[PDB]
Amino acid sequence: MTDRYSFSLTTFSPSGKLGQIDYALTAVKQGVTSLGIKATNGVVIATEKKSSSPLAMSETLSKVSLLTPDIGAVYSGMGPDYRVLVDKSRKVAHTSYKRIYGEYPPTKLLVSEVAKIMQEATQSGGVRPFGVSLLIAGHDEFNGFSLYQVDPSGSYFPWKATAIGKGSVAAKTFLEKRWNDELELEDAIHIALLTLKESVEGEFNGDTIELAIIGDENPDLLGYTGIPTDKGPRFRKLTSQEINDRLEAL
Amino acid sequence: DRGVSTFSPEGRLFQVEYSLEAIKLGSTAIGIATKEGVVLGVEKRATSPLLESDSIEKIVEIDRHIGCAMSGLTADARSMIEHARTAAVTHNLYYDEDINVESLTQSVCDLALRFGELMSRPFGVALLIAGHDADDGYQLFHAEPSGTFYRYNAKAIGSGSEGAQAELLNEWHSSLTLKEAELLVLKILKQVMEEKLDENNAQLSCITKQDGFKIYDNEKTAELIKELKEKEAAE
Amino acid sequence: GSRRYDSRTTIFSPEGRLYQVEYALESISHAGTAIGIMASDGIVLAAERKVTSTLLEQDTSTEKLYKLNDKIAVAVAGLTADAEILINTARIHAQNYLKTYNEDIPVEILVRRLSDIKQGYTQHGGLRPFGVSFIYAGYDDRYGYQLYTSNPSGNYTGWKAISVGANTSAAQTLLQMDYKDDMKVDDAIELALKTLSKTTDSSALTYDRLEFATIRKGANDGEVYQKIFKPQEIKDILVKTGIT
Amino acid sequence: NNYDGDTVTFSPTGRLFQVEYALEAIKQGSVTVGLRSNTHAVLVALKRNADELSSYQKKIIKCDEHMGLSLAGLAPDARVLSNYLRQQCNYSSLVFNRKLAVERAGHLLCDKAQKNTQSYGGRPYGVGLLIIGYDKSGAHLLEFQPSGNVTELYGTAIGARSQGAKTYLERTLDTFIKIDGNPDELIKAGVEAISQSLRDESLTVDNLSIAIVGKDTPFTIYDGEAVAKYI
């Protein structure tokens, strides 16, 4: 034993391509469509819960994940790679920030740390790149609301609205038509649902769609009362019922 | 591609066999052992006339009682010499005595097969190790990159070697004087060298019990070259 | 065992070139053009962002221009994630120097350390090189205003004016033509934008596809200020120099 | 063929070619014979020179007062394995005040060799060894192969043209096993066995190496003038 793969498995080809990164992006292309939309008073992220078999309890598989009380993430590509990145992202939010500054990191900096992890898998010895693209939405005091995309290379970009995976090219076009700088969060949710319907084949309801928001502080989700300044998480996952409520006025 | 420590189907280590090829390209070195001393001589083989030939150092002192000449990739020899000097000095520190010529040679040869995936390849240089000790008298050894060393009454290594070795087969005998041995090294170097032998492109040395290892000046070797010209222009 | 899958990222070709460095340079030649121009009274850095979208948030975005410290900035051409690794290393080096000597790090010393890091990846370790070229713009009290570039080989050189990324041959020719030693910052700004306007692969040059920065003594009395331009300020300078 | 690039690879018939190639280096080595009675054990080895100016490569190595071996193949590998044996004999004396049983020495060599046949980066040893010794259960002869196989024998030979000596000893078994208390006769029989492997060359005074160990005889090596008596 000992890991004796101490050399890069991703290397430049004669044309300057990094093969493994391109191939990782190809895996993301096959992935189920996910998207994010930024409003003036919130952000929405959504995706399809494509269940593998009807005997599977699809609520036990979380595609949208809380990273911090004010930051959430969704993905397209390889689910298992996503799951371990979420574990690492949650941990790095603590080890390299909260244990130092006594507060959760701002969105861009957590995105920066996730991106670094994904970059290292593209250069370190004996590993392949992560086969996922992430959309990370969040809020912080000095930057307000934001939405970021992170790719297999470790590159990240800020968006007003975007989509990744399967039907992203069509979905991005749909989003360019409808997005403006005066959207309220309910308008953005409504657009997210409309956009998502196009890439979804069969059943389209609260049990097949996973959708979360970064919005107002929820003191009812804090778990304790009596510290005025602690006002609760801005990340909230919409219930099956809440999604279906909005699918009628659709 | 293929491991550095791989055997061939004939039971030989590829890398060792290939390093032996590199040694055949090296400049010629010769040593002759007598009851009066061991002589060591080398072909300097300067690559251009602007190269100051006395900066070419292919004969080297290891201790007062041991010298050594090299042939092949001569840069590879430096760490072998460093180790040999360290082993000789260390032994004297631990035992208050001179170290046997064979023991020194054995210590150098232990380095040889320390390669793999330790250093990354065998040495590409062969050594003649000459010296005196009280138990076994005047001795000459041939240390190879395979880790084998042979004792020799006379030996030639480098590009002109089997020509020179055939010649040493003829000329060597147990009653050789030191002076005869010196002329013999010069004579055979002159035969196998490409350019014309002189005091600037060849170098002599010897090791005697009394005076230890000495490299000859160019003036002393010039004298021996003239003496060699006169003996041969006399039958 | 594992040897079989080793590409050997750190070997010479028979011509004496480093394959991976050459191929990294090929990668960089497809990146957005970055330009640096040095004047007597300051330095300009201008760079072209990669083929946009209308939904990309520009005012909070940073892909090309990075602050290393208060006196030194870099323009990036190549893989952004690779650049961020190196940028954070350079930022730390700058602070280590300041902590040790109580003086800001001279521009060249920072540039040499980053270049030495890049070099190491080409000689040992069996890892791929960083697919990044930098333009360094900075000031110190020894040499004043300075421009350097470094590339994946870890070689660095100083310049009066330089470009990296796409179309450097064309850009270098245009700068070679119009550059003059006595030139001032406000002219250098104009030169940089005009050069990008001509070399771009886009239909026209607009504010949303540019990052822009200056290092000026333009700060009340013997001291230096860095200015990373907001999108509105790039829009103004494009109008002012008559490109839109 | 596609399967001989390293020791960590079986062929489709289940062979280990690097090990077999290591075995091949032994076949090229100079012949050495081993045989024993109930009181003594003897090694005879034909030493090989490089040319007439050169010395004859030594083939026999002392491991302890009661044990030693002869080699055929890569001499530096013999030096490594014999050094390991010296240490193990030494450990047994210092820690347990006990002379290392020749059989244990064989088991330890087997295991040392085996590790180099199962991991990456290693190579098998390229030497064969004949180990004689006298311990608490009498005289012993062992044959070591770099595949790790160690075998206890009445007599044997290894190296180039060992087959001749090996058949001679097979014929003489019932005679030489009874040579008890007469060291000179046991050597004679060993010198006779090794003579069946000679072609062209014959046994001379700087050519022949003999070692013996037994009841009241520490392991000792005879070279030079000391073998004149037996040529």
Add this chain to the structure above:
Amino acid sequence: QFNPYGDNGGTILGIAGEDFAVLAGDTRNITDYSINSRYEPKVFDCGDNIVMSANGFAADGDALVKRFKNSVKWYHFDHNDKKLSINSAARNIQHLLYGKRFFPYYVHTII
């Protein structure tokens, strides 16, 4: 608190003549006011015509002698059965002793 040293008594005497040398020692071994043994030999033949005694703390004495005998054996292996001269043995023993400079063998050695 554990004391890793003790004192086993004993006296030794070495005298060098013109063409001979003697090394003598009493055979009593003691701790405090008790006798452990009336005959525990203390002077040893170490091979190569060398005799040795390491007196004081007996566990250290035995360890040293036993390391030196071992050193003679390895000298033979490594240097073609060359006889170890008394001066070379002396220098070698210095290195055995000084190797434990910061946790010494609590003995007075004579060869």
Add this chain to the structure above:
Amino acid sequence: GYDRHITIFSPEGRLYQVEYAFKATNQTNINSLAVRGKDCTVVISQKKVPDKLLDPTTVSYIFCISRTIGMVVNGPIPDARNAALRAKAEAAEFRYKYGYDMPCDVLAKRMANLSQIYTQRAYMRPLGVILTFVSVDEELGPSIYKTDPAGYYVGYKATATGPKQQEITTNLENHFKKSKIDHINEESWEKVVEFAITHMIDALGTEFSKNDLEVGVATKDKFFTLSAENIEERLVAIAEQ
């Protein structure tokens, strides 16, 4: 062709070594099935002892991981036991560190993460097994969580694994399309086991003797496997109805 041999991406973004590990999963030619009761979780697996020289009591692909968690494996026995030993170590360590019993879904996630690592790190091969974990969780109740060589895992109302998994799966889907509930509405585990065996018989179109099956049962606070004689009693009650 070396993207085929180690876990790096092919030009279509695929991991072939993971795909071939899924194929090894059916080498044993065994089918298994898991279902949930009101109070219990049942797992059954075909048992095939083809050689007469074998001790059939030692032939098993069901493992008692902890007192509460059972695991059935579909795949070769060496990789199965590797996974079994690891899961036992993980569950025991969890209890020591956090002071309560490791939940079935948490163990499944942990083993799924370990599997993910083997798909990303080149020096480790994937294990050619599919692991189905069962328990009656103290918070979530009857639980089935299944892990595969891709590092994927999810909870199940019921599930099946093996060469004929599709027939068993569709059979189970059709029952739940009828009953319209998440589970077998049955009080005793005996009756849930009988349901499990019955629906395997129909879906496979084969009959079982007491030596052709392996049964594991999870209840509140213990998981256990049935003997041949307990299974016989199950088979007998099935025949008489």
Add this chain to the structure above:
Amino acid sequence: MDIILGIRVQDSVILASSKAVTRGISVLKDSDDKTRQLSPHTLMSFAGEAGDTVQFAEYIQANIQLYSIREDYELSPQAVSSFVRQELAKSIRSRRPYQVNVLIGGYDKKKNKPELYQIDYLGTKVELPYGAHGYSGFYTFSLLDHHYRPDMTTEEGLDLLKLCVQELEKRMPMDFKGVIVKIVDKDGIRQVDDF
């Protein structure tokens, strides 16, 4: 060792250091130079524990000489003093700390000013018009507090120094065998060889 003094005047820095080296009972030497030139315009004097003083000083000198060659530039006295301070601060939490106190006198060619830095073994740095280590300040500071002016000449600085050394020779119990005096200014470093 014992006494080291420094004083910064108008255009130079003057460092005075005692000559005695004492091994317990005997004075082994009466001509020891307790200083190292770190660069052409920077001088360091030192006092503290035997062995450690010279080892530390030569180690600092080696590092500054290395910097000078690498950059082809002379570090400012301020930068040299910060480097030295960091090394001593690093050492105080080591396995076995350098017990060494130093004065750094340099002429800054960029600012055209002399500069005197006092650094103790803990890494306590202070820039001063005049400074000392150990008990030297106890005898001399009241004279320096009285007579010192920032615009003194080099000769006036030396005279104020003679007055300091005379007070030390009167009231100190140890015989330190006089002092070696060195001046650091725009033209570099020179020794005053009559004091």
Add this chain to the structure above:
Amino acid sequence: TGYDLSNSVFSPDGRNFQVEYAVKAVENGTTSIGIKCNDGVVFAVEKLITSKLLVPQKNVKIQVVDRHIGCVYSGLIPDGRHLVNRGREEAASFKKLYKTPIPIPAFADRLGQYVQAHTLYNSVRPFGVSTIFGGVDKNGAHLYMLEPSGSYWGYKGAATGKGRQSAKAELEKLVDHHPEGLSAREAVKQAAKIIYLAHEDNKEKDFELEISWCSLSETNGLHKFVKGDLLQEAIDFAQKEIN
């Protein structure tokens, strides 16, 4: 293709070819067997007499682990020794921590996991042996057989090596014609016979028989070599049956 060049690589059918090649080395070895009896186990093996020069009785192949476990193997002999050395370390550490001597099923998994580990990486080679082992613990007698893949099961009787087919068939007969039990002493004799019968497929060379056993009544639950009279007796029983 090229799937068979490296250990731990799955082929497109889901196989590890290097392990299958390791089996070929096992199938090329001498025959070895194990028979489980009423209160114990018997182990036997065929030792080929390569030459008259082999000292008889002196190249022992059966190996003890701890004091209650016997192991025999076919294939590459040094690989077998390496595996037993590991087995001995595992038995020592178990007894160190838990006091009681290692149970046979526990011991089997220790070897199983170790052998399986040598199929996880390309930096090592699979074991070129099948190992038959077992003994007596506090729950009775146990016989196991372990393959190069790390796969193992408990057996009533077991066989490996060149004569494995012949021996299996012989073992199958004993199991059918003794459904209630076989005594340790019977099993020793039967073991001799089956080896003699299996020796047909290695007929060019003549051989030496070697037997060992652990029985609760005959050996007190300790592993012992069958020597002297009892060995000669079983040799005679075997010789009469091949005529």
Add this chain to the structure above:
Amino acid sequence: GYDRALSIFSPDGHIFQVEYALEAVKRGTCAVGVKGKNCVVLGCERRSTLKLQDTRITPSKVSKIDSHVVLSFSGLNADSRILIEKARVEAQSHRLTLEDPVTVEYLTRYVAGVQQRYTQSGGVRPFGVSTLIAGFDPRDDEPKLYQTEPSGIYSSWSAQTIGRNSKTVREFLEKNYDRKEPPATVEECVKLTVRSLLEVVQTGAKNIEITVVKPDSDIVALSSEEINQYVTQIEQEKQE
């Protein structure tokens, strides 16, 4: 750690990675050293495809290792920085421990040793660099000039050149340099160095750098016009 043997023997006894390192030297800009009777001169070519270059700050091609020794090179520029740093550190280490600055030969032997070590260590490639190392031993007035190459061999030269078209300028020096009569002055030796470069250089513009090293740590770089004067004076003797 990454361990691959990259420098290995081929069947013909050649180490290709070391030989390919020499090909990198061949492609580098030309360097020449000539030693006079009381000086050594180091001349370097600068490739002229680059203007808009800022020569104030651009890495110069001759580097001081200590106050009395200099080093120039041909080959990979980034590789040469690693050797120069190591050599500078060793020079200060030698002063610290021996209480004497390095001899030119010692420093050469050190740099050559580093280069050799990188030809038989795992996970490293050889330096694509050859060096000329020049100066004066402390308290000695005899000039010194050594050469090193990627294999690690080194030697002393009366005059030598490395890099591209070094065959041509070696031809020149081989017939224009007399061992009996070394360039007796600074002026004389600088001229012979400039001539040898003009065989190959192109324009005599800021394409030629020259550095003179005299005894007792007296080292100075010539500037454009001072070199230009030598260029001027040389063509005016050519048309004839």
